[PDB]
Design a protein around this nucleic acid. Structure first.
Lengths: 97, 73, 97, 74, 84, 836
RNA sequence: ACUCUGGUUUCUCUUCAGAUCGCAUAAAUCUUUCGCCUUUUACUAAAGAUUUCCGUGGAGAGGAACAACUCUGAGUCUUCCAAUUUUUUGAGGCCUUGCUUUGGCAAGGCUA
């Protein structure tokens, strides 16, 4: 869109979008990019499709790395979570008297 | 006004408007020449060493400062 | 100063945005190192979906958790570079094709 | 930049002023300026002769004021 | 650039027991309640040595700072942050 | 550095204040900002919070505050005087309310952190109520102001509306608990302070007016602030402050001069860094380097706000002006806390907070070092100075002026002042401070009063730490290897010291039960037990709540018991107590320390009781504040009064013991009125001894209670959930599954989130937080606090019911199950024996 | 409002890598349990130990770029205060004693 994507339309589809633009990228090595808020907002608006519109991590209450590590350690699994082999067998110790 | 920033922590002698002497470690000053002197001993006239402590001398009553000793360690 | 320019709302939106899209500047990562669907399977599986897609979700989560848990710090290295001693040797030539 | 002297603690209080030439005065404070000139109700003069001289509302230049003592409890 | 270091030490001396000498030779030792940019010192629980040697007890005192010759502050304020 | 120690000499330049608030209301972040302001070398990372003042592994990993942490720090005032502040960083979670109280007892003032977007919520209401109980000075800080700008984008007029609504609600809540009207809160009064602890914003009306003054000059910031809130408007034609708007579309003074600059300074940093930020930065005098402008939005915003608002002098002058110093604020502390009172000579000595007076410290905190084998006491010095390497006499919770057994002589080694993680060692500590004490861990158990030996032998103790909530959750704890049982036992002692409200009790069967307030509380307790104290494997039983025992009908016939001497015969009857009266005794509305006239007047007037019956009241239930009453009813025409008074005391201990351990559920008889209808006292003193009467009193109390149809009271938790609108219907179903009835569903003003308050049985409240959080995908969060005991459905004395194992029985069966299994957990008999 | 401040890019090399080297993620070897089991070679899946590989940061060294002044900052950098509160004055003159280092000092009373 010529109006919404004003800053990025010039360099959106280049091989390395802003390689020789010394303002945004340090040089030809193409590292340490510095951007501006308008172009970042434009990029976010364009990339709304690939990004989950989640504001905080409270969605991953029991569905994050810590919970999955706990499930693997406890030989059990969250319904949505993955199933692992037991961390330690404890076949005889699994069912105590 | 570096002419008395040259004199900070030097043990200075301050002759006052009544004639009293303030021998104290020159810690601070301002635009009104109010001095902060620490461990200040008053010398009056025979001479004596009435210890005071941290004297905030108002600038109105200060006549003349002069160094007594080098700054301590 | 006016209360809010046309960039104020965009910046406020950029505040609560995913990790790539909430940085004014940043470093450059290889295209290999950019999982575009990592956050896709890190969420709960949508309802009304078949069994196969769900098992795919748990399997992706299992592989991700195994990668994260068995991560080790990179070993100290003397930085010997490939493709850099080749051009030093009198056997390789550089071009652009 | 002349800030007023911080004297609402001492408003409507019985204070004994000391004035410049060894002088003394007593009365109720009624206000001030940034220059600490004080207006006084029920002013009793209290000279060093020893007999106490009431006036009433007086104004005292702040240059001449050495000290305030709030005789009343603030 | 505006306010000096000794008035900062005077503000740091509030609550402490300072002993202020005035222009008429009267020495006022007691708890400095408040102090301003000008050296107007509201102090309290004041032991007063006059020029003759008499000591009075004046429980609430406001000294005009013009008449202050000097104040002797506590040496605790030798470690105060504005004296560094 | 030495000035930090020297400032403790002056008892007025110290402020003992506790930072309390709801869960995650920026208290820890505020303390981190203060530390960064005072410590140049301490800086938070750009994305991760500083997490300072939180030293426990659980504190960092869970993210919820666990242990209240002491922070001693010197801060300059608005005028420029360096005051000394001691801060209790307290957990905001309701389950750790006890951890607040231990820091609340030794705190002169309270700083109540309230989130701007969230609202008051539950723990804030409980905190202000409880702080009103100790009559502490109250200040309010609406933290996270940025959430009204960067999250909700509310217009500044609506932002002022929200802030005023929150302030008015807090003031009304305080007026509903505190009779003294002096506790009104307003930013112009210096009570309310505004802050955003993430971006290091901390200003009151006075602080912002002083910023204006330093910007321009010759401005009276105090009088300017006194006109910077409310329906006041500003006229630039006359530069004059009026009570009416000079124009039609004018804005209020608070919006015009305070909210508006903040809104613009945030907007120019969040939206226009590269376009308009340099202009407004040079306008306000803030000079940021080229590198500093290259940071992300959040670190840059924090940096610019740090440069602009400068020091946190608003908080400092708030505490100075509204929170009394220990020297002046000791008198109410002694009046409410000390058992002997201010009337005694010791009371007068400790009210003055004299550094040269008799030594007296009040320790209410215990801290575990790395080893965990030697605890460190932490408490307030209320009189005298404690010295390192000095003999002291530590008293106990049960110590009285008679019983000297509870004391112990201990040598105090090196002692320090705890500044969060790092503590500065000091040779001595004057009065009014907060001090860590070493070498007194062994005799100190929870609350402790420390005094000097060989002097002040007429020294009592302070009142025991009273907690807002009643810990009802109970979990049995056993060792995996009984050969390692002593170690776990040792660990138990440690946790009993560490957690103020933790109650470790060994039952008859040998089960070591632990009493906790909630799920997270016990989770952290057992994590500490396994990983830090015992260092051995442990086993947990399935969680269960305690139960109380009550009656619902008058005893059918008067039940009698006799001494083994067969000469003392006591006959009693059983009745329930009136509504609210049990709550009145619970809340210390009426006390046994009242003279008979006052208590009789209360009973006869408010509750329509007979005057003679009101004068006939003997004692209260399990404790002095027990919710059960023991009332004499022997007619003077048949029973002598003076002779009965000899065994009245023994009958009192017997009744108290009977109420402590109920016949049905083995504990906690609640809301029962007992009347002694007949007394036959043996004429000789040796035939009416306590060892003879007290068991007889227990037996007669049991018979009277069991004859009347008993009931089991299960604790009902009051759970409020803050959730988006779409999740309210789901929360309704989740609460309906666990036999909970919904009371209120109020949308939070100034926010799109509802708050649903409901009552859920505590026995059915396990996993409710996790269920609700996972069922609504983290949108609905819940906190649980004990509300009130309620009659459980079912009849505990209907033996025709059969209890199916491993099955959730219906309501009419529940009571029977709830007692029978409970008996099995105590090792007791299968059924209650009416004869015994 | 000034003199000196001296660039950044890029190609290499040499060491150190603490930190998510890496907001990404492999393989092999070895050792334990394993699942298959029938011989190697592939393997099943968890733990543990190394290793190689695709990468990374910093430091130092050597080039080119290529210009170049400057950026920037050390600072004096420069364009106004006599009316109570400090720095544009209540200042100066007389009397008694203790000692006079016979110059006079100290205290008090004064007078203006």
């Amino acid at each position: 869109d010529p109006e919404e994507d004003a800053p990025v339309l010039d360099w959106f589809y280049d091989h390395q979008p802003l390689r020789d633009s010394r303002k945004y990228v340090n040089g030809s090595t193409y590292q340490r990019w510095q951007f501006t808020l308008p172009m970042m907002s434009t990029l976010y608006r364009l990339a709304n499709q690939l990004l989950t519109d989640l504001v905080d991590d409270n969605y991953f209450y029991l569905f994050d790395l810590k919970a999955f590590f706990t499930s693997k350690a406890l030989n059990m699994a969250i319904p949505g979570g993955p199933k692992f082999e037991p961390l330690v067998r404890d076949i005889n110790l699994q069912d105590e008297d | 006004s570096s002419k008395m920033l040259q004199h900070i922590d030097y043990r200075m002698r301050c002759i006052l408007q009544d004639g009293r002497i303030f021998i104290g470690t020159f810690k601070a000053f301002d635009k009104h020449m109010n001095l902060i002197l620490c461990d200040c001993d008053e010398f009056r006239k025979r001479e004596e060493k009435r210890v005071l402590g941290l004297v905030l001398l108002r600038g109105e009553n200060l006549v003349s400062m002069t160094v007594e000793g080098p700054p301590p360690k | 100063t006016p209360l809010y320019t046309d960039n104020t709302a965009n910046g406020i939106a950029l505040l609560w945005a995913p990790r790539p899209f909430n940085l004014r500047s940043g470093r450059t990562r290889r295209a290999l190192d950019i999982p575009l669907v990592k956050n896709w399977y890190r969420e709960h599986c949508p309802a009304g979906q078949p069994v196969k897609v769900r098992v795919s979700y748990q399997k992706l989560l299992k592989y991700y958790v195994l990668n994260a848990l068995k991560h080790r710090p990179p070993k100290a290295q003397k930085k010997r570079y490939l493709f850099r001693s080749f051009k030093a040797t009198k056997f390789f030539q550089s071009t652009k094709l | 930049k002349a800030h007023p002297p911080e004297l609402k603690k001492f408003m409507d209080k019985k204070l004994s002023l000391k004035l410049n030439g060894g002088r003394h005065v007593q009365g109720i404070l009624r206000g001030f300026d940034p220059f600490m000139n004080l207006v006084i109700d029920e002013c009793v003069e209290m000279a060093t002769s020893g007999q106490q001289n009431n006036i009433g509302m007086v104004v005292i230049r702040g240059n001449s004021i050495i000290m305030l003592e709030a005789l009343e409890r603030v | 650039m505006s306010i000096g270091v000794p008035i900062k030490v005077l503000h740091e001396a509030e609550g402490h027991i300072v002993t202020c000498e005035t222009n008429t030779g009267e020495v006022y030792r007691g708890k400095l309640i408040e102090a301003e940019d000008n050296m107007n010192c509201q102090m309290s629980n004041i032991t007063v040595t006059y020029r003759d040697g008499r000591v009075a007890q004046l429980e609430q005192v406001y000294i005009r700072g013009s008449k202050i010759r000097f104040l002797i502050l506590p040496d605790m304020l030798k470690n105060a942050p504005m004296l560094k | 550095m030495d000035f930090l120690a020297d400032l403790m000499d002056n008892s007025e330049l110290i402020r003992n204040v506790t930072l309390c608030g709801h869960l995650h209301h920026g208290k820890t972040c505020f303390v981190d900002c203060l530390i960064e302001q005072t410590h140049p070398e301490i800086r938070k990372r750009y994305d991760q919070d500083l997490c300072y003042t939180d030293i426990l592994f659980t504190e960092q990993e869970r993210g919820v505050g666990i242990k209240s942490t002491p922070v001693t720090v010197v801060l300059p005032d608005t005028k420029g005087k360096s005051y000394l502040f001691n801060i209790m960083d307290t957990p905001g979670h309701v389950n750790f309310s006890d951890e607040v109280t231990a820091g609340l007892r030794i705190s002169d003032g309270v700083v109540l952190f309230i989130d701007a977007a969230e609202g008051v919520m539950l723990n804030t209401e409980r905190l202000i109520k409880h702080a009103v109980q100790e009559r502490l000075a109250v200040t309010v800080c609406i933290n996270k102001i940025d959430r009204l700008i960067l999250e909700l984008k509310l217009p500044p007029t609506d932002a002022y509306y929200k802030l005023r609504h929150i302030v008015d609600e807090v003031n009304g809540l305080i007026s509903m608990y505190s009779t003294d009207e002096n506790l009104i809160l307003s930013p112009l009064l210096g009570n309310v302070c505004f802050s955003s602890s993430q971006y290091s914003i901390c200003f009151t009306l006075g602080s912002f007016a002083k910023i204006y003054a330093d910007t321009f000059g010759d401005i009276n910031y105090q009088e300017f602030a006194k006109r910077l809130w409310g329906d006041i408007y500003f006229n630039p034609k006359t530069r004059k402050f009026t009570k009416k708007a000079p124009t039609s579309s004018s804005q209020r003074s608070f919006v015009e001069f305070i909210l508006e600059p903040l809104y613009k300074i945030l907007a120019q940093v969040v939206g226009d860094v590269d376009t308009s930020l340099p202009r407004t930065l040079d306008e306000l005098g803030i000079h940021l380097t080229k590198e500093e402008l290259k940071l992300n939005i959040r670190p840059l915003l924090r940096l610019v706000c740090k440069k602009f608002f400068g020091e946190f002098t608003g908080f400092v002058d708030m505490c100075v002006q509204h929170i009394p110093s220990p020297k002046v604020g000791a008198k109410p502390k002694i009046e409410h806390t000390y058992t002997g009172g201010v009337d005694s000579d010791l009371g007068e000595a400790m009210s003055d907070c004299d550094p040269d007076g008799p030594l007296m410290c009040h320790t209410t905190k215990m801290y575990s070092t790395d080893d965990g084998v030697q605890f460190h006491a932490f408490g307030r010095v209320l009189s005298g100075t404690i010295h390192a390497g000095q003999p002291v006499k530590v008293l106990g919770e049960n110590y009285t002026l008679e019983d000297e057994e509870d004391s112990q002589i201990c040598t105090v080694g090196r002692l320090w002042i705890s500044v969060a993680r790092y503590h500065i060692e000091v040779n001595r500590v004057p009065a009014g401070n907060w001090v860590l004490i070493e070498g007194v861990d062994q005799p100190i158990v929870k609350t402790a009063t420390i005094t000097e030996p060989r002097g002040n032998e007429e020294a009592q103790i302070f009142r025991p730490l009273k907690f807002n909530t009643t810990s009802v959750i109970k979990i049995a704890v056993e060792p995996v290897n009984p050969s390692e049982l002593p170690k776990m036992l040792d660990g138990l002692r440690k946790v009993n010291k560490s957690y103020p409200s933790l109650t470790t009790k060994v039952e008859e069967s040998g089960e070591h039960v632990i009493l906790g307030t909630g799920e997270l509380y016990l989770d952290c307790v057992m994590h500490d037990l396994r990983k830090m104290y015992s260092e051995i494997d442990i086993k947990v039983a399935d969680p269960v709540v305690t139960f109380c025992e009550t009656v619902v009908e008058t005893s059918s016939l008067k039940c009698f018991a006799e001494t083994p001497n067969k000469k003392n015969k006591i006959t009693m009857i059983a009745e329930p107590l009136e509504k609210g009266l049990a709550e009145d005794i619970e809340n210390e509305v009426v006390q046994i320390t009242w003279n008979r006239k006052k208590l009789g007047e209360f009973f006869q007037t408010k509750y329509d009781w007979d005057l003679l019956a009101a004068r006939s009241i003997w004692a209260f239930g399990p404790d002095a504040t027990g919710p059960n009453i023991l009332v004499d009813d022997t007619l003077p025409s048949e029973v002598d009064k003076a002779l009965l008074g000899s065994v009245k005391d023994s009958i009192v201990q017997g009744f108290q013991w009977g109420t402590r351990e109920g016949p049905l559920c083995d504990e906690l008889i609640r809301n029962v009125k007992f009347k002694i209808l007949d007394a036959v006292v043996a004429q000789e003193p040796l035939h009416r001894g306590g060892g003879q009467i007290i068991p007889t009193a227990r037996r007669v109390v049991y018979s009277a209670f069991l004859m009347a149809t008993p009931r089991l009271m299960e604790p009902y938790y009051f759970v409020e959930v803050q959730a988006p609108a779409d999740c309210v219907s789901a929360v309704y179903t989740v609460l309906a599954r666990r036999r909970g009835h919904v009371t209120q569903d109020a949308p939070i003003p100034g926010s799109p989130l509802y708050t649903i308050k409901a009552f859920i049985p505590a026995i059915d409240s396990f996993g409710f937080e996790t269920d609700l959080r996972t069922h609504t995908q983290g949108q609905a969060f819940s906190l649980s606090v004990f509300h009130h005991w309620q009659i459980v459905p079912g009849d505990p004395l209907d033996k025709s019911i059969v209890i199916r194992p491993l099955e959730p029985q219906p309501a009419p069966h529940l009571a029977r199950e709830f007692m029978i299994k409970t008996r099995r957990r105590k090792g007791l008999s299968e059924d209650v024996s009416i004869s015994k």
